[PDB]
Amino acid sequence: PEKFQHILRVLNTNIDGRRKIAFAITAIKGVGRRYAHVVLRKADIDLTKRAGELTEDEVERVITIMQNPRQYKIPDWFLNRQKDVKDGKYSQVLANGLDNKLREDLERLKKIRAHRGLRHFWGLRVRGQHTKTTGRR
Amino acid sequence: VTVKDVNQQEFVRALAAFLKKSGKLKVPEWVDTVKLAKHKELAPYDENWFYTRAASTARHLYLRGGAGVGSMTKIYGGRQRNGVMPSHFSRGSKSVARRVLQALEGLKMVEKDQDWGRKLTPQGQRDLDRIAGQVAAAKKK
Amino acid sequence: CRFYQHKFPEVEDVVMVNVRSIAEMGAYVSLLEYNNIEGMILLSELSRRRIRSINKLIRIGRNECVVVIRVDKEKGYIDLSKRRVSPEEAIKCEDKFTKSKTVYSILRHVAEVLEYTKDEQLESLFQRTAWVFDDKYKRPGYGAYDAFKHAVSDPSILDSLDLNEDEREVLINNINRR
Amino acid sequence: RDKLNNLVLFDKATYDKLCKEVPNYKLITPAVVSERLKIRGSLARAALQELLSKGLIKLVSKHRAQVIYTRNTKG
Amino acid sequence: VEQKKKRTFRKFTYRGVDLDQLLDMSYEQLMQLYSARQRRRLSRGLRRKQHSLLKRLRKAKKEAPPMEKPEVVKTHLRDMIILPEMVGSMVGVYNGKTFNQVEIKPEMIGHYLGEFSITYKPVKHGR
Amino acid sequence: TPDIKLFGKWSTDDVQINDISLQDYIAVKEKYAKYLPHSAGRYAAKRFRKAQCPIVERLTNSMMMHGRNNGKKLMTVRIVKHAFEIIHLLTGENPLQVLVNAIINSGPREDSTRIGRAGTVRRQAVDVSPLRRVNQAIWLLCTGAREAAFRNIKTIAECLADELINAAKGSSNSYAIKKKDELERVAKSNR
RNA sequence: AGCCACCCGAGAUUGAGCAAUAACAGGUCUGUGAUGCCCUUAGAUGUCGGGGCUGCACGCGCGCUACACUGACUGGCUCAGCGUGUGCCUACCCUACGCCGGCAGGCGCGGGUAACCCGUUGAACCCCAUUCGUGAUGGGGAUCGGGGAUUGCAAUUAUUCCCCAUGAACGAGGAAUUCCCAGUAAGUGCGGGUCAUAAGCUUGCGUUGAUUAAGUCCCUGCCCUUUGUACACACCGCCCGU
């Protein structure tokens, strides 16, 4: 019966009562259901509740934690990119910046023309698994 | 008696509070962010399962002659969901389950004994049968 | 809803249904002369002769000029016929429905012309506009009385359907628009 | 196929209705509450716990899938 | 055809080690430093008796003048991650039918020689 | 208990078995006084074992279909005993007796078997077995339960209780009332 | 000759083992130092290195995961059975326990060819508390990322594991099609095999466990005759005339 708290913004998305808080944090890139589970627990927030509650001041702390993973003890392994090819330490990348770095890996791998890039550019599958019947229809 | 005469799901929670009544249960440095098991799609809701897991361990070691690291790792895990592949039983983390064991050994709830590992402490045989009566007198499932 | 004041079809009511989705024995087809009300076809009796084919490019969304055998006014099951049909040709009811789509669509905003659609107070919307023709006896009567309205320049503002907004901002342009 | 959403906000307008739809309530599951209101079904549970805390309704089932409540003892 | 600030606009660390520092490093450090797949190549493979080719890599780099690339250093192996002393050699990489000669650069460090040589078509079917 | 055995949380007594043909295919208190519906874990050992199994036990059996839900009676008897609770809080009646009435109005009277006539579709006005009348009652009751829950906030128990109550008295809101009549439609129909 | 019924019951009810007659241009020379005729034979067809067997607008099969609430979640409860496992002639285990690491895994030993240890094999389903609320939703995990273990002399063409993250079709599946009557269907895990690493393969296993014939030749195939045959290699046969 607690209505009056329903506006939140986690980067470039609106985070209202649609699901649980953490699962509503999952609208952006670099933030999965387990990574959103952690940042709210690094912020000590019950992710059980609703994002139509829990106003932005908690979330502005959550903004500081998703931008600073290792600084808030989101450790080196938990990251979407560990020890990256760009910003070479252990960076959890976020909503709009991961879409850069996912391309920035593969666009580099074609300038290097490594096998990851050569498969990805030629319409081929990056993975060496079978593409005779799958990866198509 | 045993602790098998009293309610086991009350027992893993009344002894969990008893390990909170211990005040320390020697938690690892990594429960806010861990996988903690390759079975689990999500990180735990809290950290207070660790009391319950040791309340589930000390009940388990009350019945054994002694057990340790590999034995706890089959208890709390289950089907490892293999995604596009068939799911299968395996064992998760062996560090935090050992951290459970060194805690109850450190609190003398269980203790390194025969049969390769930790059996009950006699203080634990008190403190389990103490809170067994606390389990039994409260409710009987 | 519908521009018929009557809710349901009657016995041997030649009705124009809407083939929404084909089902197990047949298709749960919904009437459109009467609002959206579901009826059924085969197994029993819809066809007369045996040539053993149903469609080549006929995809979905058809309309069936069918005759009500059984109607369940309480339970909601309307059994339909075409095997009995020697004289109930499909062209007459559909061209009547091609009018009666527009005869309904004229009389269902209304709600002085935006139009909206949807929705006003739906039943009271039709007692003022759509069913007041159906109240106006007979049923061949408001075949012409509605046609008296959408003969718009012969004349516009004559005999009643002076209900209800006034109506007259609809009655000038929205009759010509719908 | 299906695409439905209740209001996933804790809603006073539903819950004050829930406190006032309560004599119609005798079979009170959160899904009934989520359909008699637009409360979530998740948040129906916590709202009925508040309505349990009022003592107007009473648990008759408590299963991990779904609880069931019941307004005063027999009716 | 050589080390850093040349054949590298793709700067800082490829996997955790900056190529700018790496070319001043030795690869006995690089296998220790943030190069796990290279580590399994350089610790378990462990300098895998291609030394006559490795001599030839340093022979043809020496025999050619250092302002230019080496003449030809063909290999049959394609499992070779480019080392900082390797950087500059025009390495013929065999795909089981043909030798593919690749000049190896500060950007390509960490990549196998079978990643620049191909054994496979960008598949056509009349496509 | 040695005087009378009841249901696990209800009463096998005060059950009104009120059909003509369905005597001794519907019994919960006559020989089948069970707190726990489970006979031996098989019910197809004999053709006789159908009438041996009561309707309260076959309901726990005929629910677990739909291969992810097959091999789960412990989930089922949970949801089944949940569904009796959802009956009584909607009814007040004995939810077994609601289930017992649910077999009554869902059992057909005359059905049709296939026959051929001049290339055209005719079907023979035939009775079905009171064994089948129960088996056409239960299977249509078991269909509307999992289906209506399958994309709804309601669990199967809430949909099954609504399936039993609207078939205890035919309301045409349970799946079993609505599909019995189409079976009975063809008998007075063709030829 | 047999049936039905019931008694007992393990009842006149387990599942396989197993094969007549005859047939095969069934398949296998690449299982075979079973192989005729050959080929080549030191220039090999005896070899090593590298690669392809993986490739995809696609045709098909088999599997598998999916499509939520009996589901996902977070945990907690706890019940197997079949086997097997180092000390082996071309390469080698089960692992308690003790430890470190989220995990990956590392690791310390010791036990045990074994109803002795692994392993009181305390498996999964289950079972409960939840959070979730039927939202391509958290169902789904495709795809891919960065990085880390691990196996190998070599994985690159991601061998494999993991970590997070990018978070797909799919919300029930047409034409068609498959199977099957009780521990059966299904679900569930598990053991055995191929291995240096490397299963959605496979054979077993228990486990949870349905509805349904309980009949029939209707389909369909098979046996059993008669009948006609222009068929006889036998109707995919014949066989006409334009």
> DSSP string spanning D44-60?
HHHHHHHHHHHTSEEEE
Peptide bond into C95 cis (omega under 30): no
Q: How many CA atoms lie within 13 A of B54 on its CB side?
A: 31
Say whether the CB atom of F112 is under 7 angstroms from strand G.
no
Count CB neighbours of F117 within 10 A.
Answer: 11
3-state helix, strand, coil in chain B (%, to 5): 45, 10, 50
**Angle, CA F183 vertex, CA F178 and CA F189 arms, to 5°:** 120
The span from the CA of F30 to the CA of F36, in Å, is 15
Interface subset of A 14-33, CB within 8 angstroms of B: 33
Say whether the CB atom of B54 is under 7 angstroms from strand G.
no
G strand bases under 7 Å from protein CB: 49-61, 64-78, 95-106, 118-120, 122-167, 171-172, 181-190, 199-201, 208-215
Q: Does D6 reach chain F within 8 Å, measured CB to CB? A: yes
Query: Is E116 buried (19+), middle (13-18) or exposed (0-12) by CB count in 10 A?
Result: buried
If we measure between CA atoms, which residue out of F173, F110, F108 comes closest to residue F134? F108
If we measure between CA atoms, which residue out of A32, A120, A131 comes closest to residue A79? A32
Q: How far is D15 from chain A (nearest CA, A)?
A: 6
Measure, in angstroms, how far nucleotide G139 C1' is from residue C158 CA.
Answer: 62
B10 neighbors B138 (Cβ within 8 angstroms): yes
Find how far residue F160's CA is from the centre of its chain. 10
C134 neighbors C123 (Cβ within 8 angstroms): no
Say whether the CB atom of B58 is under 7 angstroms from strand G.
no
Amino acid at position B12, single letter:
V
D39 neighbors D14 (Cβ within 8 angstroms): yes
If we measure between CA atoms, which residue out of B140, B139, B104, B103 comes closest to residue B125? B104
Residue among A85, A88, A123 minimizing CB distance to E122: A123
Q: Token pair for residue A92? A: 């959890």
CA atoms F2, F3, F9, F12: torsion sign: positive
Q: How far is C77 from chain F (nearest CA, A)?
A: 9
Which residues lie closer than 8 Å to F122 by C-beta, 6 or more apart? F115, F116, F190, F191
Q: Say yes or no for a CB contact (<8 Å) between B32 and A75.
A: no
E127: nt with nearest C1' to CA: G57
Q: Do chains A and C touch (3 or more CB pairs under 8 A)?
A: no
CA atoms E16, E19, E21, E26: torsion sign: positive
Residue at token pair 């045996």: C50
Which residues lie closer than 8 Å to E39 by C-beta, 6 or more apart? E31, E32
Q: Token pair for residue D24? A: 């119609």
Q: Say yes or no for a CB contact (<8 Å) between D29 and F86.
A: yes
F101 neighbors F16 (Cβ within 8 angstroms): yes
Could you give the dihedral angle defined by the CA atoms of residues D46, D51, D55 and D56, in that order, rounded to the nearest 10 degrees? -140
Per the structure, the count of domains in chain D is 1
Find the discontinuities in chain E where C to next N exceeds 2.5 angstroms and give the residue preceding each.
none
Measure, in angstroms, how far nucleotide G83 C1' is from residue D19 CA.
Answer: 62
Residues from chain B contacting residue A80 (CB–CB below 8 Å): none
Count CB neighbours of C178 within 10 A.
Answer: 19
Q: How many CB pairs under 8 A join C and F?
A: 24
Q: Does A101 reach chain B within 8 Å, measured CB to CB? A: no
Q: How far is A55 from chain B (nearest CA, A)?
A: 21
Read out DSSP for chain F?
--S----SSS-SSS-----SS-BTTB-SSSS---SS--SSS-S-S-STHHHHS-HHHHHHHHH--STTSTT-SHHHHHHHHHHHHHHHHHS-S-HHHHHHHHHHTTS-SEEEEEEEETTEEEEEEEE--HHHHHHHHHHHHHHHHHHHHTTSSS-HHHHHHHHHHHHHTT-S-SHHHHHHHHHHHHHHS--
The span from the CA of F106 to the CA of F137, in Å, is 5
Which residues lie closer than 8 Å to B40 by C-beta, 6 or more apart? B92
If we measure between CA atoms, which residue out of B107, B116, B127 comes closest to residue B59? B127
Residue among F90, F151, F155 minimizing CB distance to D66: F155
Amino acid at position E66, single letter:
P
The span from the CA of F175 to the CA of F158, in Å, is 14
Cα→Cα distances B89→B42, B92, F74, Å: 17, 10, 21
Q: Token pair for residue F190? A: 């063709």
Residues from chain F contacting residue C70 (CB–CB below 8 Å): 185
Residue at token pair 């067994």: B132
Q: Token pair for residue A10? A: 């986690």
Residue among B33, B41, B42 minimizing CB distance to A73: B33
Q: Token pair for residue D67? A: 């609880």
| Rounded CA Rg of chain B | 15
Q: Spell out the domains of chain C, with CATH numbers in brackets.
A: 13-87 (2.40.50.140), 88-178 (1.10.150.190)
The span from the CA of B72 to the CA of B12, in Å, is 14
Tell me which method was used to determine the 3D structure. Answer: cryo-EM
Residue among C25, C42, C76 minimizing CB distance to F172: C76
Measure, in angstroms, how far nucleotide G27 C1' is from residue A134 CA.
Answer: 32
Q: Terminus-to-terminus CA distance in chain E, angstroms?
A: 37
Q: Which helix (H) or strand (E) holds B79?
A: strand B79-80
Cα→Cα distances F39→C35, D40, F33, F43, Å: 52, 40, 12, 8
Phi, psi of F116 (to 5 degrees): -110, 140
Q: How far is A17 from chain D (nearest CA, A)?
A: 5
Cα→Cα distances B34→A62, D38, E77, F124, Å: 18, 36, 41, 68
Residue among B32, B35, B42 minimizing CB distance to A73: B32
Query: Is A22 buried (19+), middle (13-18) or exposed (0-12) by CB count in 10 A?
Result: buried
**Domain CATH code at residue D55:** 1.10.10.10
Query: Is E77 buried (19+), middle (13-18) or exposed (0-12) by CB count in 10 A?
Result: middle
Residue of D nearest to A51 (CA): D9
Q: Token pair for residue E98? A: 């043909």
The span from the CA of E86 to the CA of F77, in Å, is 71
If we measure between CA atoms, which residue out of F114, F142, F101, F107 comes closest to residue F128? F107
Q: Say yes or no for a CB contact (<8 Å) between F120 and C77.
A: no
The span from the CA of F46 to the CA of F48, in Å, is 5
Strand partners, F122: F115
E41 neighbors E15 (Cβ within 8 angstroms): no
F38 neighbors F15 (Cβ within 8 angstroms): no
Q: Are strands C63-71 and C14-18 parallel, antiparallel or unpaired?
A: antiparallel
Measure, in angstroms, how far nucleotide G182 C1' is from residue F43 CA.
Answer: 8
Q: Token pair for residue B33? A: 């962010």
DSSP B34: -
DSSP B89: E
If we measure between CA atoms, which residue out of D38, D45, D35 comes closest to residue D12? D38
- Structural domain that includes position D5: 1-75
Q: Torsion-angle region of residue B108: left (phi > 0), alpha (psi -120 to 50) or beta?
A: left
F146: nt with nearest C1' to CA: G70
Amino acid at position D16, single letter:
D
Read out DSSP for E64-102?
S-TTS--S-EEES----PBPTTTTT-EEEEE-SS-EEEE
The span from the CA of C29 to the CA of C23, in Å, is 9
If we measure between CA atoms, which residue out of E110, E24, E105 comes closest to residue A85? E110
Q: Say yes or no for a CB contact (<8 Å) between C50 and F120.
A: yes
Amino acid at position F45, single letter:
A
Q: Does A85 reach chain E within 8 Å, measured CB to CB? A: yes
The span from the CA of F99 to the CA of F96, in Å, is 5
The span from the CA of A99 to the CA of A80, in Å, is 12
E84 neighbors E105 (Cβ within 8 angstroms): no
Burial F83-108 (b: 16+ CB within 10 A, else e): bbbbbbbbbebbbbbbbbbbbbbbbb
Amino acid at position B55, single letter:
A
Find how far residue B74's CA is from the centre of its chain. 11
Q: Torsion-angle region of residue B83: left (phi > 0), alpha (psi -120 to 50) or beta?
A: left
Q: Token pair for residue E42? A: 């350089």
The span from the CA of C21 to the CA of B38, in Å, is 46
Strand partners, C67: C14, C81
3-state SS class at E4: coil
| Resolution of the experimentally solved model in angstroms | 6.3
Count CB neighbours of D65 within 10 A.
Answer: 12
3-state SS class at D70: strand
